[PDB]
Design an enzyme around this catalytic site. Structure first.
Site, PDB file in Angstrom:
ATOM      1  NE  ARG A  95       3.896  -0.489  25.286  1.00  0.00           N
ATOM      2  CZ  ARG A  95       3.668   0.695  25.647  1.00  0.00           C
ATOM      3  NH1 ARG A  95       3.691   1.894  25.077  1.00  0.00           N
ATOM      4  NH2 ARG A  95       3.858   0.693  27.090  1.00  0.00           N
TER       5      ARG A  95
ATOM      6  CD1 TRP B 131       6.717 -14.074  24.080  1.00  0.00           C
ATOM      7  CD2 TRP B 131       6.582 -13.772  21.845  1.00  0.00           C
ATOM      8  NE1 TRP B 131       7.450 -13.110  23.596  1.00  0.00           N
ATOM      9  CE2 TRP B 131       7.510 -12.720  22.439  1.00  0.00           C
ATOM     10  CE3 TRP B 131       6.344 -13.693  20.357  1.00  0.00           C
ATOM     11  CZ2 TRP B 131       8.145 -12.015  21.468  1.00  0.00           C
ATOM     12  CZ3 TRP B 131       7.218 -12.866  19.550  1.00  0.00           C
ATOM     13  CH2 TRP B 131       8.159 -12.056  20.280  1.00  0.00           C
TER      14      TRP B 131
HETATM   15  C1  HEM Z   1       4.848 -10.423  21.346  1.00  0.00           C
HETATM   16  C2  HEM Z   1       4.789 -10.709  22.719  1.00  0.00           C
HETATM   17  C3  HEM Z   1       3.850  -9.828  23.770  1.00  0.00           C
HETATM   18  C4  HEM Z   1       3.907  -9.909  25.151  1.00  0.00           C
HETATM   19  C5  HEM Z   1       5.287 -10.855  26.024  1.00  0.00           C
HETATM   20  C6  HEM Z   1       3.209  -9.321  25.796  1.00  0.00           C
HETATM   21  C7  HEM Z   1       2.738  -8.860  27.163  1.00  0.00           C
HETATM   22  C8  HEM Z   1       1.732  -8.497  27.651  1.00  0.00           C
HETATM   23  C9  HEM Z   1       1.160  -8.688  28.932  1.00  0.00           C
HETATM   24  C10 HEM Z   1       1.908  -9.624  29.993  1.00  0.00           C
HETATM   25  C11 HEM Z   1       0.085  -7.869  29.217  1.00  0.00           C
HETATM   26  C12 HEM Z   1      -0.829  -7.939  30.477  1.00  0.00           C
HETATM   27  C13 HEM Z   1      -1.852  -8.568  30.012  1.00  0.00           C
HETATM   28  C14 HEM Z   1      -2.877  -8.901  31.156  1.00  0.00           C
HETATM   29  O1  HEM Z   1      -2.350  -8.963  32.439  1.00  0.00           O
HETATM   30  O2  HEM Z   1      -4.052  -9.334  31.035  1.00  0.00           O
HETATM   31  C15 HEM Z   1      -0.169  -7.215  27.872  1.00  0.00           C
HETATM   32  C16 HEM Z   1      -1.260  -6.212  27.642  1.00  0.00           C
HETATM   33  C17 HEM Z   1      -1.521  -5.808  26.162  1.00  0.00           C
HETATM   34  N1  HEM Z   1      -0.939  -6.006  25.026  1.00  0.00           N
HETATM   35 FE1  HEM Z   1       0.895  -7.067  24.886  1.00  0.00          FE
HETATM   36  N2  HEM Z   1       2.381  -8.694  24.680  1.00  0.00           N
HETATM   37  C18 HEM Z   1       2.705  -9.139  23.584  1.00  0.00           C
HETATM   38  C19 HEM Z   1       2.019  -8.674  22.096  1.00  0.00           C
HETATM   39  C20 HEM Z   1       1.349  -7.867  21.878  1.00  0.00           C
HETATM   40  C21 HEM Z   1       0.598  -7.622  20.741  1.00  0.00           C
HETATM   41  C22 HEM Z   1       1.226  -8.341  19.390  1.00  0.00           C
HETATM   42  C23 HEM Z   1      -0.391  -6.734  20.909  1.00  0.00           C
HETATM   43  C24 HEM Z   1      -1.204  -5.915  19.940  1.00  0.00           C
HETATM   44  C25 HEM Z   1      -0.996  -5.852  18.575  1.00  0.00           C
HETATM   45  C26 HEM Z   1      -0.470  -6.335  21.978  1.00  0.00           C
HETATM   46  C27 HEM Z   1      -1.209  -5.481  22.931  1.00  0.00           C
HETATM   47  C28 HEM Z   1      -1.686  -5.383  24.154  1.00  0.00           C
HETATM   48  C29 HEM Z   1      -2.556  -4.829  24.933  1.00  0.00           C
HETATM   49  C30 HEM Z   1      -3.660  -3.613  23.856  1.00  0.00           C
HETATM   50  C31 HEM Z   1      -2.749  -4.888  26.185  1.00  0.00           C
HETATM   51  C32 HEM Z   1      -3.525  -4.355  27.035  1.00  0.00           C
HETATM   52  C33 HEM Z   1      -4.824  -5.127  27.243  1.00  0.00           C
HETATM   53  C34 HEM Z   1      -6.043  -4.768  28.238  1.00  0.00           C
HETATM   54  O3  HEM Z   1      -5.802  -3.643  28.695  1.00  0.00           O
HETATM   55  O4  HEM Z   1      -6.792  -5.733  28.702  1.00  0.00           O
HETATM   56  N3  HEM Z   1       0.594  -7.094  22.998  1.00  0.00           N
HETATM   57  N4  HEM Z   1       0.630  -7.556  26.963  1.00  0.00           N
HETATM   58  C1  KN4 Z   2      -1.039 -10.291  22.775  1.00  0.00           C
HETATM   59  C2  KN4 Z   2      -1.019 -10.837  24.200  1.00  0.00           C
HETATM   60  C3  KN4 Z   2       0.129 -11.272  24.470  1.00  0.00           C
HETATM   61  C4  KN4 Z   2       0.304 -11.571  25.897  1.00  0.00           C
HETATM   62  N1  KN4 Z   2       1.452 -12.058  26.449  1.00  0.00           N
HETATM   63  N2  KN4 Z   2      -0.659 -11.734  26.583  1.00  0.00           N
HETATM   64  C5  KN4 Z   2      -1.936 -11.003  26.411  1.00  0.00           C
HETATM   65  C6  KN4 Z   2      -2.998 -11.026  27.184  1.00  0.00           C
HETATM   66  C7  KN4 Z   2      -3.700 -12.481  27.166  1.00  0.00           C
HETATM   67  C8  KN4 Z   2      -5.094 -12.611  27.748  1.00  0.00           C
HETATM   68  C9  KN4 Z   2      -5.731 -11.773  28.211  1.00  0.00           C
HETATM   69  C10 KN4 Z   2      -6.958 -12.213  29.085  1.00  0.00           C
HETATM   70  C11 KN4 Z   2      -7.917 -11.254  29.702  1.00  0.00           C
HETATM   71  C12 KN4 Z   2      -7.565 -10.881  31.049  1.00  0.00           C
HETATM   72  C13 KN4 Z   2      -8.347  -9.874  31.688  1.00  0.00           C
HETATM   73  C14 KN4 Z   2      -8.563  -8.480  31.159  1.00  0.00           C
HETATM   74  C15 KN4 Z   2      -8.699  -7.481  32.003  1.00  0.00           C
HETATM   75  C16 KN4 Z   2      -8.677  -8.129  33.439  1.00  0.00           C
HETATM   76  N3  KN4 Z   2      -8.165  -9.544  33.201  1.00  0.00           N
HETATM   77  C17 KN4 Z   2      -8.609 -10.525  34.126  1.00  0.00           C
HETATM   78  C18 KN4 Z   2      -7.473 -13.687  28.763  1.00  0.00           C
HETATM   79  C19 KN4 Z   2      -6.538 -14.553  28.309  1.00  0.00           C
HETATM   80  F1  KN4 Z   2      -6.885 -15.770  28.426  1.00  0.00           F
HETATM   81  C20 KN4 Z   2      -5.334 -14.142  27.784  1.00  0.00           C
HETATM   82  F2  KN4 Z   2      -4.461 -15.137  27.135  1.00  0.00           F
HETATM   83  C21 KN4 Z   2      -2.159 -10.593  25.050  1.00  0.00           C
END
Ligand code: HEM
Ligand code: KN4
Ligand code: HEM
Ligand code: KN4
Ligand code: H4B
Ligand code: H4B
Ligand code: ZN
Lengths: 409, 413
Positions: free
Chosen positions: A111, A280
């Site tokens: 974030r 990314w």
């Molecule tokens: C720019 C680089 C970004 C990085 C490095 C990053 C990194 C991450 C990571 C590692 C997670 C955990 C995902 C998982 O384990 O499934 C996550 C979750 C999340 N990201 Fe970020 N993210 C990025 C951009 C964004 C953007 C652009 C948005 C929205 C506009 C966003 C919104 C969210 C949300 C809503 C979650 C929670 C999703 C869920 O609860 O399944 N992220 N992010």
């Molecule tokens: C914007 C952004 C940046 C970043 N760096 N990463 C993400 C998450 C990316 C991501 C999520 C999932 C779902 C994982 C599910 C959801 C709950 C339990 N889990 C098994 C599948 C993907 F193929 C994937 F690419 C988003």
């Protein structure tokens, strides 16, 4: 009341006032904490206070609270909900709201980038072909030849629930998964079911190990339609190791663009059920979860084989050794192909800097420790030692039901 | 509150149903609008507060032995009630003390080792009156629990709190820890975590060897008196020199650790009675030593030195040199403990055992409170099964609780 969070490594104590602004529930009570539950449990009269609150914080953000422009917008929004049972956001409000849903995403460690977000307004879209065009432009823009740029594309809001825009893919780019006759699974096992929906809808599966799935897009409540993303728009990285020359022989690759396409963006009481957003990768998303979850590609045994590790007893930590090497390979591969990626050390450090920023200028930062702490090497990263408060601020990204569980064909 | 709460395991799809949370007694710190699940820490009872707390416990004890509502149950209730009436407190029977201590462990949401909860040796030390006597009891505990390396879980329970001005306390946070010494130049010798307690010991008369692994003396307070110093007999302190099965140079780092983890600063609450001195001990999960003790930045902090001896690229974080060294340090710790036949458990076997324990508790007991933030090990989290397990956290009694540090509250005589 004010609440204090402490970092037990640095002894820094931040003071949270921002939580006082929440009204959505977390799932916890004074007696049961649901901090590790992944998913805990409108009308004109529900809509205006939500609209009012959002307009109020927008005009308060541009430091024109109670201004003439503010006052007219409130009445403009009041009359519009009155006569039409909904309202339409201004462009400026759309962009503000989308950046702030990212800012407020408690589970996101990335974030620190929240205000650098390219917002694509797709609220004039009306068909699945239009959605596909918008999504192709998104993928192209965000991929940017490996210099990835955060982006979100926002399709028309929900109206009556019967005309929803939905991206049926959970992420824009994913690999297919196939149930093999002999019982095992080819490709990505997490997508066996969605792949079969695409097959059942006419997709010709190459039945490989990394087949990019087609897009399956639903506009205005209609049946979804299949589209193939042009391959030159799908950037991929062959995974190799900087020291183990046998690693490329594993035949592993992954896509460069992480793009979540199944969440619901809520802004001022309006619900955008199709809002693909992308940034990314953090290397562990691929190297730990995608490759090493027992229910995903599950490659740990194979790598530990080529490393010739003793795999008879768990206490040799053969799994932990192979895990680190797999994650070295992913970071090395992306960096060598000049594709944006961040390691979990840099990302968590940035997130601690971000929390510091948000506490100073905003009075807090909602954060879900369970999700922020990386899935490997937790306590050698600084977030492990960081107390966090989790609470729900709006605008927000929310989960929604899978479309194949509600859609009438 | 709803009657049934469901938790899911996302790797296996197993869904479990919790009803035990309805018996929750204390506060978590969370509210409907904020979750405090990563917050580390989120004058005695009167007759009126004590009555219902004791009945709750006694009812529970007699339920566990299939004698609920029996004559012995009603009689025990009457005797306890009379004792609170005339003395404003009461004394536990030996059976009730043993039951209560095992259940405080069984209820400890932060403990991954609870599959063992019913095998706990309980030493009743409620007849102790002096710090010397406390020293005797603790020595026998250490010797019994160490068992020449075949470690046995044990708890020693000193007299309960009366008016709060006669507390028994072990001033040590753990029975066996290494000293830390701040230097004039700002560096630290030994364990930096223990510099404050070490300074207290020196002030109370301890002569410090000023080494890297000096076992601290016991500082023991009986009946609210000033605490007194005792040296644990070194032959009772089992230690393990750390070596690596592959890297011959690893022993040249001079690392060792003690064999017995023994927490001694917690308060045991049973039936509203408060046991402010209740040292308990089990055996280590390797990561407690290999990850936290050795590699926390504010602790022994050896990742740098190990990475150098491994000849790793330490210029970029993306080489994962830290992760690579962390694994080998944890390999050495498990290998050194197993070679010396001192009980230890790796984080893979412990978390698998905990999942099986949690499923059994859900089956036979209707729930198992668990603190995911503590249960998931500090390395390789997602390749352990607890990472994927949803957990409900809630506070059941009997329980182990935190309490103020005794130097912060003691009235010196
Ligand atoms: C720019 C680089 C970004 C990085 C490095 C990053 C990194 C991450 C990571 C590692 C997670 C955990 C995902 C998982 O384990 O499934 C996550 C979750 C999340 N990201 Fe970020 N993210 C990025 C951009 C964004 C953007 C652009 C948005 C929205 C506009 C966003 C919104 C969210 C949300 C809503 C979650 C929670 C999703 C869920 O609860 O399944 N992220 N992010
Ligand atoms: C914007 C952004 C940046 C970043 N760096 N990463 C993400 C998450 C990316 C991501 C999520 C999932 C779902 C994982 C599910 C959801 C709950 C339990 N889990 C098994 C599948 C993907 F193929 C994937 F690419 C988003
Ligand atoms: C027998 C083998 C045992 C194992 C493998 C084990 C494992 C663990 C581990 C790894 C922790 C986390 C410690 C930390 O990160 O600081 C822990 C915490 C805890 N354990 Fe166990 N334990 C065992 C025995 C016991 C016993 C015998 C008791 C009590 C009778 C107990 C009660 C607790 C409590 C209360 C905590 C929380 C401590 C705190 O909040 O600081 N454990 N245990
Ligand atoms: C019975 C039992 C078995 C087992 N396996 N482990 C334990 C914990 C042992 C233990 C705890 C601590 C406290 C660490 C503090 C507390 C919060 C922050 N942290 C820095 C220091 C130690 F030296 C120690 F040995 C107990
Ligand atoms: C049960 C638990 O809530 C679940 O496994 C969570 C744990 N933490 C996580 N953290 C991240 N970043 N991503 C995840 O999918 C999960 N899964
Ligand atoms: C801030 C966070 O709550 C704190 O660092 C916790 C995290 N989880 C932990 N888990 C265990 N087992 N032991 C700990 O000391 C901690 N520390
Ligand atoms: Zn909570």
């Amino acid at each position: 009341r004010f609440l204090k969070v402490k970092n037990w490594e640095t002894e820094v104590v931040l003071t949270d006032t921002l939580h006082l602004k929440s009204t959505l529930e977390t799932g916890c009570t004074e007696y049961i904490c649901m901090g590790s539950i992944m998913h805990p449990s409108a009308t004109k009269d529900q809509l205006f206070p939500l609209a009012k609150e959002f307009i109020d914080q927008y005009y308060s953000s541009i430091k024109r609270f109670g201004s003439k422009a503010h006052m007219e917008r409130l009445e403009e929004v009041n009359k519009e909900i009155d006569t039409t049972s909904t309202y339409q956001l201004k462009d400026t409000e759309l962009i503000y709201g989308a950046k702030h849903a990212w800012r407020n995403a408690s589970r996101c460690v990335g974030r620190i980038q929240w205000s650098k977000l390219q917002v694509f307004d797709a609220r004039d879209c009306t068909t699945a072909h239009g959605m596909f065009n918008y999504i192709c432009n998104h993928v192209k823009y965000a991929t940017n030849k490996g210099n990835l740029r955060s982006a979100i594309t926002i399709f028309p809001q929900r109206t009556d629930g019967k005309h929803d825009f939905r991206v049926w893919n959970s992420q824009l780019i994913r690999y297919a998964g196939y149930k093999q006759p002999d019982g095992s699974t080819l490709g990505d096992p997490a997508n066996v079911q969605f792949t079969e929906i695409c097959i059942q809808q006419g997709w010709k599966p190459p039945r490989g190990r990394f087949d990019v799935l087609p897009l399956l897009l639903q506009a205005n409540g209609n049946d979804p339609e299949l589209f193939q993303i042009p391959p030159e728009l799908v950037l991929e990285v062959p995974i190799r190791h900087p020291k183990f020359e046998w690693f490329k022989d594993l035949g592993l690759k992954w896509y460069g663009l992480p793009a979540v396409s199944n969440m619901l963006l809520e802004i001022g009481g309006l619900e955008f059920s199709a809002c693909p957003f992308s940034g990314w990768y953090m290397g562990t998303e691929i190297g730990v979860r995608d490759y090493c979850d027992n229910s995903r590609y599950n490659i740990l045994e194979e790598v530990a084989k080529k490393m010739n590790l003793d795999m008879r007893k768990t206490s040799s930590l053969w799994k932990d050794q192979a895990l680190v090497e797999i994650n070295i390979a992913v970071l090395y591969s992306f960096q060598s192909d000049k594709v944006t990626i961040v390691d979990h050390h840099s990302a968590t450090e940035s997130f601690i800097k971000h929390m510091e920023n948000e506490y100073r200028c905003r009075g807090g930062c909602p954060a879900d420790w369970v999700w922020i702490v990386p899935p490997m090497s937790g306590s050698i990263t600084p977030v492990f030692h960081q107390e966090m408060l989790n609470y729900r601020l709006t605008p927000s990204f929310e989960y929604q039901p899978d479309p194949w569980n509600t859609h009438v064909w």
